[PDB]
Amino acid sequence: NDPLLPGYSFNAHLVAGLTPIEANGYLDFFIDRPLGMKGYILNLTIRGQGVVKNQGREFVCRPGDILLFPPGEIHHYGRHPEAREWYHQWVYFRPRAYWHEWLNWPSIFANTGFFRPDEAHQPHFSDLFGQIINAGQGEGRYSELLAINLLEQLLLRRMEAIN
């Protein structure tokens, strides 16, 4: 099934994609998983604006913003009501054991993290995020491993950036 719509199982394998939300279109609905997921999600906004909701709180994500949703965290977000669209790339994954230090991002609220590269590094992170999606969507024997690897690269580039 389409991972962008209900009925798709996210569990142990990495899954990546682009959710091109456009007002009034087929994807114009909120992600609403109050019990969270069985793995992590990294979300990069590439167009428009999204609104991330969590127990009454709202945070507007804009192009270049990267959000981190650890397992069990509430997933409640969708296109900002005042924006015509919210295109966001995302990657669902289970981390390698040693990735945890790099998964500690400052929370906008609850345990939903946020990282935004500075303008100089925006293109590189966006490019890298796209590579993750391309790899994650491959069917090759090493596709998932490559996606995992690229995601590790992103986490490390962030570690470099914040430092």
Place this chain on the structure above:
Amino acid sequence: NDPLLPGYSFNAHLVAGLTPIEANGYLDFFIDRPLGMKGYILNLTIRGQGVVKNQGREFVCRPGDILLFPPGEIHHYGRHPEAREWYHQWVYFRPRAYWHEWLNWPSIFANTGFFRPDEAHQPHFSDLFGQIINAGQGEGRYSELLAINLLEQLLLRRMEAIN
């Protein structure tokens, strides 16, 4: 110490660099580690030609050729006498445990691995190898991790390319 000159103490840390050998220049001598090293080395020729020696045998490496020298493997190589130069990028490393299946390369002799990406892949491996060096020579606290990550990517890109 300059890792480009004999006597530099290698160890568990990844070290990467460019050895721009020019005929009669300060790097115009052969690497001669007849009992090998504790770690692995990936070598990418980027300019000129090198001659890799092993118990009387010689292999001429050219731009685009990637060599793998596993621990204990003889290192005996230098600028090909017919070449004005031999610029090679290299990365000395201890692999992550799970990389084992990606480090079993076809040998030119003994257990000296060889990988020549096809024409389409060449630029990608060239760029990736350059990223490894860039990361590996980085100043940051995550430079080594980033180099290791990029190396893993190269290994996986090779697995992907040959599969």
